[PDB]
Amino acid sequence: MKTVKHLLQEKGHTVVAIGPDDSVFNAMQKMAADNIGALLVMKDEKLVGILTERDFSRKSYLLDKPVKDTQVKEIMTRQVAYVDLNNTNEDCMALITEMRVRHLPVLDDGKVIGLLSIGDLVKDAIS
């Protein structure tokens, strides 16, 4: 049994973010640049959503508008499931599997301090 604190230590404390009013083009370019599949959507230090590859895959082409003309807020997930430092690997795997989400932001006392994904949990398990 491993804590989220320790899972984050293994993985790193990078938080890659974007603003809700930025373009989906810029968002998808940023995911490509970092080879990631999610962005924390931050406004005035508030986590207002998460933008994922699934959000893009499901929503973007259904808008009668190009990606440069769509804002992140239009397609982001607004209800964000997250974990805290005292949650465990068991908790993460259950949330990922049963909620069917690939990313779990990590929140500490009001601050987004990291992100864990399904790939992190797989990597930790096989290491």
CA gap 37, 54 in Å, rounded = 9
Secondary structure (DSSP) of 77-119: B-S---B-TT-BHHHHHHIIIIII-SEEEEEETTEEEEEEEHH
Q: What is the DSSP letter of 45?
A: T
What residues from 19 to 78 belong to the interface with ligand NAD (CB under 6 A)? Answer: 36-40
120 near ligand NAD (CB under 6 A)? yes
67 near its own copies (CB under 8 A)? yes
- Report the side by side order of strands in the sheet with 17-18: 17-18, 38-43, 46-52
Pick from 9, 10, 29, 46: which binds Br ion (CB under 5 A)?
Answer: 46
Q: Which two tokens stand for residue 61?
A: 């082409």
Q: Which of ligand NAD, its own copies, Br ion, none binds 94 (CB below 5-8 Å, type-dependent)?
A: its own copies
Q: Which of Br ion, its own copies, ligand NAD, none binds 116 (CB below 5-8 Å, type-dependent)?
A: ligand NAD
Q: Which of its own copies, Br ion, ligand NAD, none binds 72 (CB below 5-8 Å, type-dependent)?
A: none
Phi/psi at 27 (nearest 5 deg)?
-65, -50
54 near Br ion (CB under 5 A)? yes
Contact 95/83 with Cβ under 8 angstroms?
yes
- Binding site, by residue number, is 11, 16, 37-38, 54, 96-97, 102-103, 117, 119-120, 123
Rule CB under 6 A: which residues touch ligand NAD? 11, 14-16, 36-40, 96-98, 100-103, 115-120, 122-123
